[PDB]
Symmetry: D2
Subunit: 422 residues, 4 copies
């Protein structure tokens, strides 16, 4: 008794919010992938932070490494609501990751070593290593209980995924005790589970270390001159060889409004998945429940007026089907379908928006037809523009993925001669 | 030089947020009129507070007297964002107005006397007496500059209003210097201005006193056994007899996005004006600009998901014309017109909502037709209900004003047998 | 597993901060006993609030009933640091206890009934009834675990106390299962424990109810016309007759830095105990540990400069032995012993302060000798005053208890002709 | 009228908190000079921030460049108390100053260019360039009024200083209109004022630019390949050649409790001045008034218990003369003189501390004699250590300045074999 309440209390979260999101390819070019707008008013890292609140871990480490100003500002404004006198705080740890090191060189692990003295000053018994550019719902206290029950030194959150995409994350092979037998990091030919050939038991980048080991284990890897200083390439394979690595099935701890559904864990890294995962919310029955009161997700909530709908220049009405319209939006006529409008979006008359993601402060000119697109923050689409109808034009002007999703950025439009400053 | 910056610094605001709003007649029965929801996510007193922020008066006194729990909670959550170490705070002063005293007996003024020692502890040179159940935009620093320039002891904000409603507020007659010649409080036959017969120069319940006089002036009225201890009936007529009362034309200080319009000051006290003033925002060109960045109005902003629009049970779309939909709302089909939806309103399919004000957390059942109505907070309208089409039915069930506006409350619906707890 | 973490989450604290502290007899005459300054920078209710934080109960109800302005202001400034979007808040519930009712008439319980609808809106499974004018350290989660393990409907925190003072609190007789056999409220002849004749097993005013019962149980007592609507006189005796009342030995849950000591629970209600409990902190080995990092006690922490020590008018030094000097204090010479100085105390030269409690903003004139006294907040002791040396003089001027403790208030000194406004 | 209130509103502060403080030589080796502890509980940058609050400039830019984690954390905890919805915020701008650039290469100015787009997003009419590693009290609104009255494009705060140290700051020669005639940056032979030979009219690193010029002026210097991108070397000399530079005598705007004193502006950069400026506060009549209520200086105020004084191991008392003891300190006996104790300092028995600055969390062992020293944060001085009595020993072990001041750091003591981790 009195373990699940005294386990978060002794533990500290370390959100590795340094992802470059290179597969968004322009969207995160300007801001860290943890700061990517998602689903109304939220930011991706909020998820990884909210799970730490609702799981009782009120001591978090936000390790900002690349292009991190908006993440710093966002944390400062929204999550600067803790009294540090009662051991509950979001320590924003600038990583200052070595410039000598290239993109993902002096990797994930080298950023948690540079700030090791400050982590030691926390005197935690346990530590929660997290990837803070993912979307999921999880109670980390259930994972800490499952970590202490097994008497392990590292606990990896493992989930079965399709074997056609399992090369993107580390793949493990476990025994009856969920103890790791074999870890392999980004394999070209992922091994399947024994019971399921079409699936692979992949890691989720959610580790739980006992602190005194983690420290003892980082320095050995820090002195190493051959390692990539990466949690998947170097540390977890070593712990697997030692035999002190255990697995945690994510279905045990995922926070689901409805128990019947398949666990929800979206690795947003590619544009087409960002678009899909933003449009899941606009559907008739979303897979991710934002209206869950048992498990609320918090963000920086600014004072916006209600979403205003008005008549077009001709005086007619506007139609909306399966759409999200956040605060500050203004709409005039303009049939909307399957789309998601972030804050302060102005859509003038005669517009047809279908399956679009409009990031904050967009200005859509009159008579615009937008389809299967992602409009970056603070764009100004000119009058008469047409996107998504002719594929070759959209590839020629904007970034069009192989699937058909289009990404419209200020830069692209500036280059087209449509002046943006407004 | 350096007067307008050093004038708010020496002054403290006193918001008289004890209004009963008796002319709403059920709406404020449960909460103080300053806590009445207005226009999306705001509360009326926020206006009187925001004007104090944007006018530099960061020391406010919120004198809560009647049925004041939601106002206390609202202040505690939203406006508890000040560091008192730098002389900037919202002192929530429980008035504890004498029970012996009846409704508006031991009036406006007796509530600012009971807490006089604490007001003296502020050591202010000036004090701003405000009515905190009104809607307006005003820069009080311009009023303090105009107060010091004239060398007065009390400065009353005066505005011309129609003489057919001027009996509701105190009426003054001023000279060329804006110095008060004759004050009269709630006259049955309001005297007209000399230049305009159809108008009367009425007070707005916005006074500015030099503190050392105000104190000296309250005690004399406090020792008095004949007075009503009311700022309009007792104090300001006395100052008018002394000749130390001056007037401030509200057009000089009103904060207007567009200078061409007539000043905006709504005395919400009656239901029909609450409805109109809430529906002005949904119109094509509102008279009150909420999107003004120079003069933002702040409220308690809670984290709500975006306004979700979905398909009805039949799969068809939903139409919105000249409407406001705040955060957390959910709509399925349901043609909406000229209405305003507060937070967390759920409107099921086949509904026709026209010129309605739906306060937070309403649940409208399927196939509801609502017209020219005001639905009180946390109602649950049953399936098939029809309001606003047949006047006699709406008078028989709910409160129907003489104009045609309908007010739907939990109590009324509970009495009809429609069980509300959900 | 996962009970102690999911038990506070479903529970809400109700701090009954309406105590009049009549046995302080002037100290709480001006402010609610929960707002009584204690031990440096803290307020008594902070203890009852901090225990709710460190025990995970982040939903608190502060039921303010009498003379409650400083408590409201204190909560608003200090404990208004919660985001209510994640179910964690201090709901300041004005009780508005019936005036018809006299001092402790329509008692403890009638104040938790008037606000019952709002408590129901919390949808808690459990509720923690607390006395918020006491000093103690306790982990309420251990008490909730012990409450669920026994399968009870009310859990009372019981502690053995001396039988010479056991008439002050309710006395219970329990079985081997800690199930209540016999409850009796403020008996003139308290029954002793069977094993110890010199002690009585008394209640601590810390109850834990399962919510759905509590509601069901308040209304029955609310409809009652014969009850005192008191938790000790009416409700807990009834639950004892039903047989659904269980006891919780406070030694199991008390948070002690050193396990060897006897539990620390001070019922401050009398002046002499307020003085002793404030001087325990100044001793060489305090019984209550404020430097405990595992269990921090939070208060409204204002920005004060360090405690300044300077030379007297003659240039000599100042001596301090077993003393506490909080922020903002200023001392010149002035031998100090066994005393406790609250914020912004100025002690001029040639003063001898021995075993004194100086509340905030005191001004001690030159050549003052103070001994075994309690100086109320914002006093101004004149030059040459002598307290504590001649008992009859101190009884004649100030309030001198039977033990010898002296209480100096502004009123008393105003009456002596020593003008205080400074 | 209504200029001094509408001038801060249109202006934004830019605190250049990237100083390396190389002349402290170990003290700032670990933390940015703006984060250097000063005078009880404050940090140097707090001054530059507090002046912006009390001068109405509630929009600040904290440009963190070097070794900036504690400054980020300090801002996040203390100064994250603003609602950004009402245009009032501390935007923490990571500078990410070019590594290619050496210490003070791509200087002061290049750090305000890299973040130019975000500064433009503020749409300020004026901008306040500040050095955030200095100590002073100033009302910037008086400076903005004096800036608009003269019709200038840059306003430099100028003060006469002694000509024996005037080579450390830029030296100007002005006309009767306070218009700059000749600027020269760090001259080896500073020119004296015409009326005073012993003084030079030096700059204070406090500039006020009209924004649209500043932008226009940075890019020209940014395109330049020959400049040092320094505000003193490059920009202000260019503006002086244009003739659009004006001077602001700092005595007009300094905030002084007593008008008779000489303005207080301490350039802390050297250790001996840090020690003196920290010991000015402990004196009998400090030159800098921290008890000023008109102009409060705010810091991150954590909940600390009062400064505890107790008896030594032998039971004797402790003497304090002209000393500051902040919260959390603990003292046993231990004669103290002319010193300043930061938070959580523990001084065991038999210690003689004279004219010392003990930074937070120091642990002084028994029988220590400390004189004319500066003990760095979180040291642990062993038993019997003697500092300041024999100069050669202190030079051999610790850093001893030419004047006699000693600086004790963890590193130094670690190297001596006194293990520090506690
Ligand atoms: O080319 P620009 O003008 O920087 O525009 C790129 C856009 O990226 C942004 O930096 C994105 O902002 P955030 O990612 O910080 O929310 C916008 O501020 C900006 O308009
Ligand atoms: O009859 P009930 O159940 O009190 O309902 C009346 C309604 O008035 C309210 O008190 C209004 O709330 P606020 O005015 O505090 O926003 C609701 O909480 C409540 O549902
Ligand atoms: O007789 P007075 O002037 O009210 O003085 C009584 C004292 O009691 C106090 O109200 C006590 O204050 P708190 O109890 O609110 O801390 C002081 O403000 C006041 O000086
Ligand atoms: O050699 P170490 O262990 O880093 O110690 C150096 C000291 O400098 C510090 O970083 C100074 O802290 P701050 O400057 O952040 O207040 C201490 O945390 C630390 O103890």
């Amino acid at each position: 008794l009195m373990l699940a309440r005294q386990l978060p209390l002794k533990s500290v979260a370390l959100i590795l919010a340094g992802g470059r999101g290179t597969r968004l390819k322009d969207l995160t070019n300007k801001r860290a992938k943890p700061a990517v707008h998602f689903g109304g008013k939220f930011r991706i890292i909020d998820f990884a932070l909210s799970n730490c609140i609702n799981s009782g871990i009120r001591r978090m480490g936000v390790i900002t490494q690349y292009q991190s100003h908006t993440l710093v500002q966002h944390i400062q404004r929204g999550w600067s609501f803790f009294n540090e006198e009662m051991n509950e705080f979001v320590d924003l740890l600038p990583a200052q990751q070595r410039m000598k090191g290239e993109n993902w060189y002096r990797g994930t692990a080298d950023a948690v070593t540079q700030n090791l003295d400050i982590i030691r000053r926390y005197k935690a018994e346990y530590v929660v290593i997290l990837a803070g550019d993912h979307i999921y719902k999880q109670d980390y206290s259930r994972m800490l209980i499952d970590h202490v029950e097994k008497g392990a030194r590292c606990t990896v959150a493992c989930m079965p995924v399709p074997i056609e995409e399992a090369s993107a994350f580390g793949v493990m092979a476990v025994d009856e005790n969920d103890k790791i037998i074999e870890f392999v990091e980004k394999p070209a030919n992922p091994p399947s589970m024994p019971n399921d050939p079409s699936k692979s038991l992949a890691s989720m980048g959610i580790y739980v270390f006992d602190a005194d080991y983690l420290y003892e284990l980082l320095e050995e890897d820090d002195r190493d001159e051959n390692s990539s200083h990466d949690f998947g390439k170097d540390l977890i394979p070593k712990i697997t060889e030692a035999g002190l690595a255990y697995a945690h099935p994510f279905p045990l701890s995922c926070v689901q409004s409805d128990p019947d559904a398949e666990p929800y864990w979206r690795d947003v890294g590619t544009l087409e998945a960002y678009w899909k995962a933003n449009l899941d919310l606009a559907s008739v029955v979303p897979e991710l429940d934002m209206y869950d009161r048992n498990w609320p997700i918090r963000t920086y909530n600014e004072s916006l007026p209600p979403a205003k709908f008005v008549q077009d220049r001709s005086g007619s009405h506007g139609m909306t089907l399966n759409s999200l319209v956040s605060g500050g939006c203004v709409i005039s006529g303009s049939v909307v379908v399957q789309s998601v409008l972030f804050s302060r979006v102005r859509v003038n008359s005669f517009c047809n928006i279908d399956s679009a993601v409009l990031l904050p402060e967009v200005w859509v000119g009159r008579s615009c037809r937008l389809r299967r697109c992602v409009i970056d923050r603070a764009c100004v689409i000119p009058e008469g523009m047409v996107i998504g109808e002719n594929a070759e034009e959209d590839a020629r002007r904007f970034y069009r993925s192989e699937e058909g999703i289009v990404l419209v950025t200020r830069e692209m439009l500036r280059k087209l001669g449509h002046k943006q400053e407004r």
